Amino acid sequence: SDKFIYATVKQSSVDIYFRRQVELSTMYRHMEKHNYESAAEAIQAVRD
Amino acid sequence: PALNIAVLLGHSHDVTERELRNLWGPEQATGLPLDVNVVALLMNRTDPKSLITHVCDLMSGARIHGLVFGDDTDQEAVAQMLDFISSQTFIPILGIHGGASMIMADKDPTSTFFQFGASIQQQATVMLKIMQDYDWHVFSLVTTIFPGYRDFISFIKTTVDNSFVGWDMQNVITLDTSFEDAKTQVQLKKIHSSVILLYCSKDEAVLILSEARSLGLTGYDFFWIVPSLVSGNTELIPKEFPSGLISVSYDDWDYSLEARVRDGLGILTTAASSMLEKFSYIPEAKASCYGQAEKPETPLHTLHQFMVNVTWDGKDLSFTEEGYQVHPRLVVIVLNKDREWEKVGKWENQTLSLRHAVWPRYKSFSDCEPDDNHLSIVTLEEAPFVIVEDIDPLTETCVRNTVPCRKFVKINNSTNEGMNVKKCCKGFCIDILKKLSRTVKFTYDLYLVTNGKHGKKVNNVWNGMIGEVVYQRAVMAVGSLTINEERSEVVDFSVPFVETGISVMVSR
Amino acid sequence: GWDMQNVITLDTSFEDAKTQVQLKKIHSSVILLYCSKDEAVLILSEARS
Amino acid sequence: KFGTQERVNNSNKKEWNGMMGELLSGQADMIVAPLTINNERAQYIEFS
Amino acid sequence: KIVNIGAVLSTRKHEQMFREAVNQANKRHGSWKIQLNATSVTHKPNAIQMALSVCEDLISSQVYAILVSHPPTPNDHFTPTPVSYTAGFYRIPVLGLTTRMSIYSDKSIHLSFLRTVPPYSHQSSVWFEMMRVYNWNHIILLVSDDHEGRAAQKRLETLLEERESKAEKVLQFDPGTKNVTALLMEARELEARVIILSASEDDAATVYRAAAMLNMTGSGYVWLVGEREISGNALRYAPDGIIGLQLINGKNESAHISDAVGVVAQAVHELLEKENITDPPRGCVGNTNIWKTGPLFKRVLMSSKYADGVTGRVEFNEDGDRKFANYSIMNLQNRKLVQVGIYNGTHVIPNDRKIIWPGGETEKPRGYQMSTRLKIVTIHQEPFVYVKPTMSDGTCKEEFTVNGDPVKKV
Numbered sequence A: 001s002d003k004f005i006y007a008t009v010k011q012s013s014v015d016i017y018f019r020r021q022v023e024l025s026t027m028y029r030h031m032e033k034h035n036y037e038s039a040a041e042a043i044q045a046v047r048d
Numbered sequence B: 001p002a003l004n005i006a007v008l009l010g011h012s013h014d015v016t017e018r019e020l021r022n023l024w025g026p027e028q029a030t031g032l033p034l035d036v037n038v039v040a041l042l043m044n045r046t047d048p049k050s051l052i053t054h055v056c057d058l059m060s061g062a063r064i065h066g067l068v069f070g071d072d073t074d075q076e077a078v079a080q081m082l083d084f085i086s087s088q089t090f091i092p093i094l095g096i097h098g099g100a101s102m103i104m105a106d107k108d109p110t111s112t113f114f115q116f117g118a119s120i121q122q123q124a125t126v127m128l129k130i131m132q133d134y135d136w137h138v139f140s141l142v143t144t145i146f147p148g149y150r151d152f153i154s155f156i157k158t159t160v161d162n163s164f165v166g167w168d169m170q171n172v173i174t175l176d177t178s179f180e181d182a183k184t185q186v187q188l189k190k191i192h193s194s195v196i197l198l199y200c201s202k203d204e205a206v207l208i209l210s211e212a213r214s215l216g217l218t219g220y221d222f223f224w225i226v227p228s229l230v231s232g233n234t235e236l237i238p239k240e241f242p243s244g245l246i247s248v249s250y251d252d253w254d255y256s257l258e259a260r261v262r263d264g265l266g267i268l269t270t271a272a273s274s275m276l277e278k279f280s281y282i283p284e285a286k287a288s289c290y291g292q293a294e295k296p297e298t299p300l301h302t303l304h305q306f307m308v309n310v311t312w313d314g315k316d317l318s319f320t321e322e323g324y325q326v327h328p329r330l331v332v333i334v335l336n337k338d339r340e341w342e343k344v345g346k347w348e349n350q351t352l353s354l355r356h357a358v359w360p361r362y363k364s365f366s367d368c369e370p371d372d373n374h375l376s377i378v379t380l381e382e383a384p385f386v387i388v389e390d391i392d393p394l395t396e397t398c399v400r401n402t403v404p405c406r407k408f409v410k411i412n413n414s415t416n417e418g419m420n421v422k423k424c425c426k427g428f429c430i431d432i433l434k435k436l437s438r439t440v441k442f443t444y445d446l447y448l449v450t451n452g453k454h455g456k457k458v459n460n461v462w463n464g465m466i467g468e469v470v471y472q473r474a475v476m477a478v479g480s481l482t483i484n485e486e487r488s489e490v491v492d493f494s495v496p497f498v499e500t501g502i503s504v505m506v507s508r
Numbered sequence C: 001g002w003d004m005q006n007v008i009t010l011d012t013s014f015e016d017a018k019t020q021v022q023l024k025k026i027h028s029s030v031i032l033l034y035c036s037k038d039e040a041v042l043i044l045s046e047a048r049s
Numbered sequence D: 001k002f003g004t005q006e007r008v009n010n011s012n013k014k015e016w017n018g019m020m021g022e023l024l025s026g027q028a029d030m031i032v033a034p035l036t037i038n039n040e041r042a043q044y045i046e047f048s
Numbered sequence E: 001k002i003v004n005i006g007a008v009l010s011t012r013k014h015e016q017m018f019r020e021a022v023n024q025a026n027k028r029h030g031s032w033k034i035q036l037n038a039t040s041v042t043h044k045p046n047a048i049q050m051a052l053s054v055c056e057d058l059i060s061s062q063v064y065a066i067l068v069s070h071p072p073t074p075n076d077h078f079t080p081t082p083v084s085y086t087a088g089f090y091r092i093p094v095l096g097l098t099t100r101m102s103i104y105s106d107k108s109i110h111l112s113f114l115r116t117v118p119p120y121s122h123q124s125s126v127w128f129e130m131m132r133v134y135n136w137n138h139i140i141l142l143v144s145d146d147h148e149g150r151a152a153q154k155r156l157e158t159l160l161e162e163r164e165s166k167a168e169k170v171l172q173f174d175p176g177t178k179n180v181t182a183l184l185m186e187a188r189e190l191e192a193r194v195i196i197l198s199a200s201e202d203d204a205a206t207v208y209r210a211a212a213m214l215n216m217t218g219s220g221y222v223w224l225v226g227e228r229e230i231s232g233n234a235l236r237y238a239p240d241g242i243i244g245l246q247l248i249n250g251k252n253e254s255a256h257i258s259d260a261v262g263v264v265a266q267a268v269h270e271l272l273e274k275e276n277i278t279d280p281p282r283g284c285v286g287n288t289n290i291w292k293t294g295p296l297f298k299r300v301l302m303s304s305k306y307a308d309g310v311t312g313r314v315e316f317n318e319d320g321d322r323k324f325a326n327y328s329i330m331n332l333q334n335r336k337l338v339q340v341g342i343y344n345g346t347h348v349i350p351n352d353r354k355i356i357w358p359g360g361e362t363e364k365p366r367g368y369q370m371s372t373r374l375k376i377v378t379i380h381q382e383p384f385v386y387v388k389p390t391m392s393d394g395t396c397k398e399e400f401t402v403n404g405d406p407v408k409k410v
């Protein structure tokens, strides 16, 4: 949905894994707009 | 300053010298700092001695700073000769039509000779674009020892290796010689149902296609895509060419000769204007071809670096370093059931626009087996069963677990017609259809219904998927179609693969 | 649990357009052939090719 | 970036970014980092 | 009955010996059925003048083939380009005697052009054999950016693809670059010590001079080059121990004239035994149609194997170039080229001479030198790779774990 926002590190192994998967494609399109530049920034964003 | 541009043409065309001069009379400040004195000339025939004498007389008398050459015959040698002449006179020459328009591979570095044509690389790019647009990812590659085949194969391999599309290039076949004798049947017999990119000459493509028909390689499911090399002269068509032979070529239908000459003059004038803005003045032409002048002869300023950045009235006619047009006017033509080359698609500003969104099946020959394993299937979008989405932005093709489906979307409500946009359909019913295709061994052309909605009898006329099926516009209706008494009376239903009654949903 | 993929009958000649699209349909590793010796020679030569 | 095959905007060429591109371009001889082993990366470089 | 054969030759005496060779071939084959006329034209300084002269003199004489060679002047900037174009209009076969440029191997440009000398790109084949003989798997190419360098690179990579191996780096420099130290510096940091050069004499001299200052010509390095890079100015600055090639009769006008005349006479005799043969066009002006049997004549010529040639067994491959030529491998020992082996049609065979590799050592240098200074790349991941700013003295403060052991930092 638009309330629960989730993402991961841009251009990383998990991004490739979600791109390759056939079932999860929809939620991949949810993460491509919120992917973070680094893991530390994503962790900080989760923290606050 | 005055810029003298010479236009050499042939008697085959009906254009006259007065018309060529009048072509440069638009009078809207075509050249801001300079005017162009077009001098026209018609030559009976093109051959080394007379061609050289004509060009040298033009350079000596008219003192031309450029040239626009349009040849009538199909002599591929002429282009080479023109290049040579340019390297000996530094006259910027433009190949417009005929032999001068056939792209030569490696021009002399010191020669300013540009051609109105598409190289084999651009033709291969257009062919791969056709294949990607029609989802013909699996393909073969049959070439011969014809010159330039190595570059064609190398470019195809490079484009396949550097693309996100599947591009399952099954094999590469190089028929050295003795197509019917031996050592070629063995290679040609391992090609299965796929797209066969063929690179050879016309007189040799005839033999290759005859052998392929003898080997049963020209069915409904075999698509032979070829460059302009084998299509050649559209007027003459061999009986060995199968119908549906897809080819790409420089368009001689819409791009008229007058438009070609106007574009060439515009290119030369814009390059001269850019040189005037950047450099000091127009360099005077060389004194003469003959005499063996003792000088390096290299001009201080030339038009070579100014033809790469050219923008005429509306079109971008820029050239590359090798002398190819950056935006060639390429057209994709097929050999229809009437045995005439019918234009299908076009290649404009790096986009391939195709008339047929879905590829029409072409009967290759009169004795070809009838098409029975190919079916037209209707489908309607339902949220859990048939999900319709757009094409993948990354790979520009339908994603995994999803199948192409053409939706007839109108331009707007103002018009009473539309275009078929190829979207990607998935879901429960689409998975069922894929399994059915795998098991029953049939191919399908999925397409969304635009007449009605799930089927209904209005004025004794069925709309929707039921209407499409009953009126023989489709073979089956895969979707969220409920078995009914009247529908079963009208059409024949399969076994119900999911139980769907009528039920009432309320807010808790 | 036999898996009998297809039945192929070579009614036409063994070199024309037919019996090439038919013979290409064989994807199994076992082929039960039935013909005369003279026809077997031609069919096996075509299969080897 | 850890590394992911992306299309460069010109000529539509596949290219590796991050550590993958650094190693494949010769700028680095080894990647001692949390580099996940997957099929996409293993086709071009080889993991221990 | 009389059959004309044209020859654009460097000097008058070359034309005389061409006529003598034509007479000898006519005597050998027999002039009772067909007599081989021989017309000759000296080269002209202006390319346009030469393209007019071939029309006025050779084409107007209704010739069947044209034998073109380089002029006596040392300049060789694609001299047979006029002829190969003009006689290429009518698909009249053209025999190149001593033109070793790689552009003429492109049959899409020079439609009807054969030659009895392999182009400068086929030298790469020899290099490959050396790699098979001395077991060199890591190499560096220094091809130029023109058509010749690209052709040599393409041929070498095509050969290497059969070995499922690739050159470490293919460095390309524009022709006539004064400063090339950047590419050489880039090459030095690599591992491969087999440096292969494909460049003109001036560019080869520039590369040699720029590599001398970088001490890249010392012990452990091995240089493989062609014929242009050990001839002329490039030989003046050539590093010692360089290994180059030399075609046995590449600069011999008379032998090539004789064998080309012999093979063209045999091809003419074989062709005139076929049906519906068409006479060649007479005069360029007023005749705009190609020779009908021109392609057939060229196909006959490419499929003809001269038995006893002065330069050896004359054989043309699919590209129309000479096949199975003899390359005399030369090594620069004490500022003097000595033949340390010869590459025959397929294999390299050495001789009693000892190869002195660069640096003066006699033992065969290894292909490369493994680097023990790995360039490591890391990414900032908190549990695995902490990264912290350094203090002002260039290091960062030493810490200790809970056990008191110091943390190892780089």
Ligand SMILES: *[C@@H]1O[C@H](CO)[C@@H](O[C@@H]2O[C@H](CO)[C@@H](O)[C@H](O)[C@H]2NC(C)=O)[C@H](O)[C@H]1NC(C)=O
Pocket (backbone or CB within 6 Å): E004, E037, E038, E039, E056, E057, E060, E061
């Ligand atoms: C080949 O035959 C032609 C005649 O068909 C000869 O061409 C002329 O020969 C004379 C004397 O050698 C020259 O002065 C003329 O200039 C030639 N005509 C032309 C084209 O101008 C030719 O000599 C014969 N070849 C030989 C040397 O025997």
Ligand SMILES: *[C@@H]1O[C@H](CO)[C@@H](O[C@@H]2O[C@H](CO)[C@@H](O)[C@H](O)[C@H]2NC(C)=O)[C@H](O)[C@H]1NC(C)=O
Pocket (backbone or CB within 6 Å): E179, E180, E181, E182
């Ligand atoms: C040739 O080019 C190289 C690379 O540019 C020069 O090497 C260095 O170039 C930088 C500028 O990019 C200078 O600041 C350095 O002083 C150069 N170091 C040296 C001396 O190698 C090189 O100097 C150039 N050589 C010539 C004579 O043009």
Ligand SMILES: *[C@@H]1O[C@H](CO)[C@@H](O[C@@H]2O[C@H](CO)[C@@H](O)[C@H](O)[C@H]2NC(C)=O)[C@H](O)[C@H]1NC(C)=O
Pocket (backbone or CB within 6 Å): E344, E345, E346, E347, E348, E349
């Ligand atoms: C010269 O070229 C030939 C091929 O034309 C090379 O092949 C050798 O040919 C000889 C002919 O008697 C054979 O006996 C050898 O067995 C062939 N080579 C090998 C080692 O298999 C030959 O190597 C070249 N050089 C020589 C030694 O003549």
Ligand SMILES: *[C@@H]1O[C@H](CO)[C@@H](O)[C@H](O)[C@H]1NC(C)=O
Pocket (backbone or CB within 6 Å): B043, B044
């Ligand atoms: C073209 O043909 C005409 C008629 O034969 C002739 O008069 C004219 O000289 C020819 N063109 C030129 C200039 O050679």
Ligand SMILES: *[C@@H]1O[C@H](CO)[C@@H](O)[C@H](O)[C@H]1NC(C)=O
Pocket (backbone or CB within 6 Å): B309, B310, B311
């Ligand atoms: C040259 O190319 C540039 C690319 O941005 C373009 O903006 C400019 O208009 C071109 N030169 C002309 C036509 O003045």
Ligand SMILES: *[C@@H]1O[C@H](CO)[C@@H](O)[C@H](O)[C@H]1NC(C)=O
Pocket (backbone or CB within 6 Å): B348, B349, B350, B351
């Ligand atoms: C061609 O298409 C590209 C991509 O949409 C666009 O950027 C370009 O402006 C187009 N050129 C024209 C003028 O059609």
Ligand SMILES: *[C@@H]1O[C@H](CO)[C@@H](O)[C@H](O)[C@H]1NC(C)=O
Pocket (backbone or CB within 6 Å): B413, B414, B415, B416
């Ligand atoms: C415009 O839309 C209306 C429905 O609002 C439709 O009835 C009408 O046919 C449309 N116009 C056309 C397609 O002529």
Ligand SMILES: *[C@@H]1O[C@H](CO)[C@@H](O)[C@H](O)[C@H]1NC(C)=O
Pocket (backbone or CB within 6 Å): B412, B413, B414, B415
């Ligand atoms: C045409 O398209 C526009 C797009 O904004 C839409 O608003 C309008 O309703 C459509 N109908 C007409 C006027 O054709």
Ligand SMILES: *[C@@H]1O[C@H](CO)[C@@H](O)[C@H](O)[C@H]1NC(C)=O
Pocket (backbone or CB within 6 Å): D008, D009, D010
């Ligand atoms: C295109 O690619 C180049 C090279 O990676 C990059 O520098 C540039 O920013 C890109 N442009 C865009 C916005 O796509």
Ligand SMILES: *[C@@H]1O[C@H](CO)[C@@H](O)[C@H](O)[C@H]1NC(C)=O
Pocket (backbone or CB within 6 Å): E213, E214, E215
């Ligand atoms: C060899 O040349 C290099 C070039 O940088 C230089 O640094 C080095 O000191 C030289 N070694 C000798 C032999 O003096």
Ligand SMILES: *[C@@H]1O[C@H](CO)[C@@H](O)[C@H](O)[C@H]1NC(C)=O
Pocket (backbone or CB within 6 Å): E251, E252, E253, E254, E255, E310
């Ligand atoms: C050229 O070859 C011939 C025949 O082999 C020979 O007699 C002549 O001396 C050679 N000339 C040179 C300079 O190589």
Ligand SMILES: *[C@@H]1O[C@H](CO)[C@@H](O)[C@H](O)[C@H]1NC(C)=O
Pocket (backbone or CB within 6 Å): E275, E276
């Ligand atoms: C040679 O040409 C004749 C026509 O003059 C033709 O009948 C014959 O078949 C040709 N020979 C070949 C190519 O078999």
Ligand SMILES: *[C@@H]1O[C@H](CO)[C@@H](O)[C@H](O)[C@H]1NC(C)=O
Pocket (backbone or CB within 6 Å): E311, E312, E313, E324, E325, E326, E344, E345
């Ligand atoms: C090459 O060298 C051998 C050495 O015996 C010589 O006899 C022969 O004529 C040459 N053959 C070729 C391939 O030119």
